[PDB]
Write a protein that binds this ligand. Structure first.
Ligand SMILES: [Cl-]
Ligand SMILES: [Cl-]
Ligand SMILES: [Mg+2]
Ligand SMILES: [Zn+2]
Length: 152
């Protein structure tokens, strides 16, 4: 398996194109009907930074949970004793551009639990192999992973 390079994305097309994660559907706000279709992730093998102390980053679509949970298994296989870590998920605080998949339960920013940046390119490759529809080495400090919408 070949690690991704900094700022590389796989597949090598824009995130919201049909062969990647597909179009945005619209921001999800708390207590909306679409919010009620999100599912919380309390997987003990994933560390959630949850800096807002709201648990919002745990709320994600079922496809996002499926791929994230597969990635959590893969991380523990690659580096025994290390866990997947989520630093950003579903944003309620307005940090991202319009049409960001972070507003839809469809995107996560991730690291390893030890914050060893030398692992991040490989972490991104593991996310591709775990089935995320788009993976991007988005900053020196994290990998961005997203999924197609349930209606796909
Ligand atoms: Cl779980
Ligand atoms: Cl943390
Ligand atoms: Mg946040
Ligand atoms: Zn991101």
């Amino acid at each position: 398996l070949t690690p991704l390079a900094y700022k590389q994305f796989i597949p090598n097309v824009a995130e919201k194109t049909l062969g990647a994660s597909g179009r945005y559907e619209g921001k999800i706000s708390r207590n909306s009907e679409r919010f009620k279709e999100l599912t919380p992730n309390y997987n003990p093998d994933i560390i959630f930074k949850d800096e807002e102390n709201t648990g919002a980053d745990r709320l994600m679509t079922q496809r996002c949970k499926d791929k994230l949970n597969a990635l959590a298994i893969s991380v523990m296989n690659q580096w025994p004793g290390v866990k997947l870590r989520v630093t950003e998920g579903w944003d309620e605080d307005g940090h991202h551009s319009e049409e960001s998949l972070h507003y839809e339960g469809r995107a996560v920013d991730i690291t390893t639990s030890d914050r060893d940046r030398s692992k991040y390119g490989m972490l991104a490759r593991l996310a591709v192999e775990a089935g995320f529809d788009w993976v991007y080495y988005e900053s020196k400090a994290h990998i961005h992973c997203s999924v197609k919408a349930e209606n796909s």
